[PDB]
Design a protein around this ligand. Structure first.
Ligand SMILES: N[C@@H](CCCC[NH3+])C(=O)O
Ligand SMILES: N[C@@H](CCCC[NH3+])C(=O)O
Ligand SMILES: N[C@@H](CCCC[NH3+])C(=O)O
Ligand SMILES: N[C@@H](CCCC[NH3+])C(=O)O
Ligand SMILES: [Mg+2]
Ligand SMILES: [Mg+2]
Ligand SMILES: [Mg+2]
Ligand SMILES: [Mg+2]
Ligand SMILES: [Mg+2]
Ligand SMILES: [Mg+2]
Lengths: 296, 296, 296, 296
């Protein structure tokens, strides 16, 4: 199986005057490459995939591909949709335009059954010849890819190689790797990066790495090298920021933090996402001063 | 305030050969008209809004508007989206093409904050001059429109006149109508249609009415006439079908029931939606036998 | 079946110097009688059954029976336990000492299966010949008496005549009375007393009635007389106090309110229950100011 | 601080003719001693704490103490109660009768606030001078001891040295050990023993160890020696049995397994607990075949 593992970042999508700041987007990606990151995920949940047009979605995939060219950093392009024809369209674009693989979030809002999720992902996996990483985040989609469905998709489709798990369910992560230890389990929840990696997980898709890419890189690589003491220490070190980055719905805190660190020009979202409250704004500012944030 | 209340149907969207069966859609709508319905909701959750293109979405709004011409039946067009610019575009389309009002689902997947939900809906309400009904279904979206937010939107925007509640939270329906008795509370959960109407609710947006439009019509109108004994009697008879129509994710059962009743030619969904299991297929078939289903 | 319905109060148990204030207990019950209450529930959840000894538990049943003799007020004695031999002992004591019936909470902590719940209650019901009311409050017991189990127990044992439902599940309340309309559904959740009564519920076991017995009785009797407009009016008026009485875990707010009204000597609980926070103390004090509180 | 860590067993309580089989209790304890166990927990949740009288509860503590003398196996006596005067009484008994420490479950049913839980445990901790391990199991108690409360209790009371977590919340386990790394975090959830130990947890109080004490012992020790690859392998091997032992409410499956293994004479159980369903009886039987079960 072909895979994409290691320390990965769910890139924020900077806006300026309501448009994707394409120069700042590329700038942020090269900052990730320079700080030990193994792969970048354009237009995931953290990249405000919901409010980008299909054209902007595609633009941000191409920028990631262009900026990572000439390096060892892979591109795992966000390609999910709650409509299978929409997800297939995104997957074929990412293949044809040079992405190393795709991330595909479980369909949100329309709650497909497990049988529907299987056919959804099998159509996607058969749409391309590049690795496909499932992405389960039931708190946002309203659905769960059961362990049995994940395992069936891994075993039945050649290019489905693992799942990015954002469920806060360490039992499921044991369940997955005890019954199918060949899969690539990916942490989609920063606070429990170390526990998931300690159990055989092979990488992270991080929100915190937007702000602290070097710390997430070191954590992941220590862990993959089985230096569990140093991986755990950084994970414990990062707990406060890992949780404060979810005082409000992601990516509202991380974009506030990137703005507070001077890494993006304007604290702009697309509705219905918005600025945080002034209280959470101050709480984000207060957790940040305790960490050293790399610039460009 | 202008309002759209009474017995309403979240229309299934019949497809045929992967395309919207526009002839069957029109037939099904007039079947609702023939059976006492006060309103139709094109392309809600039950109409598989997620898997229709923006074109198809717009086509189904126009067909509903066209089919209701010459009758009292209003069109409450599904116009929700998790992207505010998409929701405004759909709202403006529904206004310009003759819809009587719009339904606007709470943004799914990206779970905006309460402040974000407020600004999301205020942009929608100010984009048009026709009534807007909020739609809260936290089980599918991942977010909740709090009671205060609903009440603030009702009081701050002229055309926001109520909410379609699909939360199974009779506490919240008391909260809403106790603090703002002028709002139009709409039941979005068939099994508890009568309790919501019993507490001052002014209508339903029904899944069951697709199959039994006459019974949901009678139930709602009895309740509005304060014949609570008869409204409860119908609510109690329909419990079995009201619940089995959610054996699997709506609209998989209701489309299965319509197919088994010979009301749609094809048992068609768009992926990631699918046929139900054979066991649930038979369980739907067996609940139907205790109800008399109207034809065309 | 013999039944105990109407407006009922889950009596607080006042303490003085760590002991049951037996004189205040009788005074409070007599005050309930004077304000239209149909039955009182000694030593329910609101009566701190967990922290009373078995003899103090038995003393409060005896006072309730004695204080209610010669009046309209029935005694529905709390007799539940998570140990069946304990629940049987309490039930037989209540029978032997003149209680008109018993309430019996679903076993807490040890989460018995549905078959265990049937055998638990069948043992209780066969131990006595007085009415037995089930009590479902899963947020505190960790288990739920399923709808099928309640109905089976209602149909298989003569003296099991209904359930006190404190689950916030109006769907379940429709489920119960649609399949078994002969049972006595009792509201155990003050905020939604009216919706439960509107659907055929036949009484309440109220926490709020400790403070405002006149309003809760009147609400119940309006509803039972099918004056749904006045029943709903009181339910809506009472929402703020009904909810503020759960800012902290019942019976901490109601005892705070009773103390604030000059209805009990001191604000004493038994550990692990404690006085509320300074915030919730002031919030309770101020919601009370909007209601008229009856004296002795 | 004095501590009790390592591999520990929540002992089942065998019954015979409705009575505690005290000879079987001693044999079962000695089987644990001979299979690498570091501690035994008499009358925990798995010991049917709820349905034992206070006298039998005390009998089983003394049997555990007597059987472990002359060995290194410590006794961590179950001493919890939802009444503080009851919990203090048990703690004083265990201290006076030679127990090495006490486990004390969070109060069930009566849902104390965080302030009450603090005072509940502080009263317990000051009643004795032997180690006290908190026990958080919100699925059974209806309350949770927050991370802040646990940390306050550990730092403020000398003999409170850790917590047995049965919450399925690996985030909370990172939270606990990142902010207070001196505490002894103990796994109370067999399926995720290794992840909790992987993050700095220092032991388990296991249900599976009743049946497979050697494997749970080996896992624990490997993990404590930071041999995570052998600990994880055992944890993965044990997953199927670790979950099947909760197909029904613990301790119904483990007692079924012990009976099927010929380690107890009768499948007793004290109401409201009951023998499992026929199917689940067969499912547990089946799962057992994949493990080598030690005799006496
Ligand atoms: N708002 C829609 C369309 C997104 C367009 C491309 N990401 C969705 O969330 O699926
Ligand atoms: N699948 C996308 C686009 C749907 C467009 C028409 N409803 C969504 O669910 O938001
Ligand atoms: N605290 C124990 C004993 C209560 C005995 C009198 N209510 C329990 O809640 O079961
Ligand atoms: N069944 C009651 C009494 C048990 C007392 C002895 N453990 C309870 O669990 O609280
Ligand atoms: Mg290395
Ligand atoms: Mg989030
Ligand atoms: Mg198409
Ligand atoms: Mg909509
Ligand atoms: Mg347990
Ligand atoms: Mg060693």
């Amino acid at each position: 199986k072909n895979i994409i593992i290691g320390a990965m970042t769910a890139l924020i999508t900077p806006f300026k005057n309501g448009k994707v700041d394409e120069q700042s987007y590329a700038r942020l990606i090269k900052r990730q490459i320079e700080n030990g990151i193994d792969a970048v995920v354009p237009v995931g949940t953290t990249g405000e995939s919901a409010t980008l047009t299909h054209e902007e979605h595609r633009t941000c995939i191409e920028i990631a591909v262009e900026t990572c060219k000439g390096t060892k950093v892979k591109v795992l392009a966000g390609a999910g949709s709650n409509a299978t024809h929409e997800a297939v369209g995104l997957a074929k674009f990412a293949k044809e335009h040079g992405a190393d693989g795709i991330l595909s979030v479980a369909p949100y809002y329309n709650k497909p059954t497990q049988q529907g999720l299987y056919e959804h992902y099998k159509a996607i996996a058969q749409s391309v010849d590049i690795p496909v990483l499932l992405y389960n985040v039931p708190g946002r989609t309203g659905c769960e890819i059961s362990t049995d469905t994940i395992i069936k998709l891994f075993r039945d489709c050649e290019n489905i190689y693992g799942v990015k798990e954002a469920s806060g369910n360490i039992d499921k992560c044991v369940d997955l790797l005890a019954h199918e230890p060949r899969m690539m389990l990916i942490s989609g929840e920063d606070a429990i990066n170390y526990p998931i990696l300690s159990n055989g997980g092979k990488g992270v898709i991080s929100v915190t790495s937007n702000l602290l890419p070097d710390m997430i890189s070191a954590l992941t690589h220590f862990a993959l090298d089985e230096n569990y003491k140093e991986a755990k220490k950084i994970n414990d070190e990062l707990y406060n920021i890992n949780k404060i980055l979810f005082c409000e719905s992601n990516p509202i805190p991380i974009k506030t933090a990137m703005y507070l660190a001077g890494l993006i020009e304007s604290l702009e979202f697309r509705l219905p996402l918005c600025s945080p409250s002034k209280e959470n704004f101050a709480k984000i500012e207060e957790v940040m001063k305790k960490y050293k944030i790399k610039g460009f």
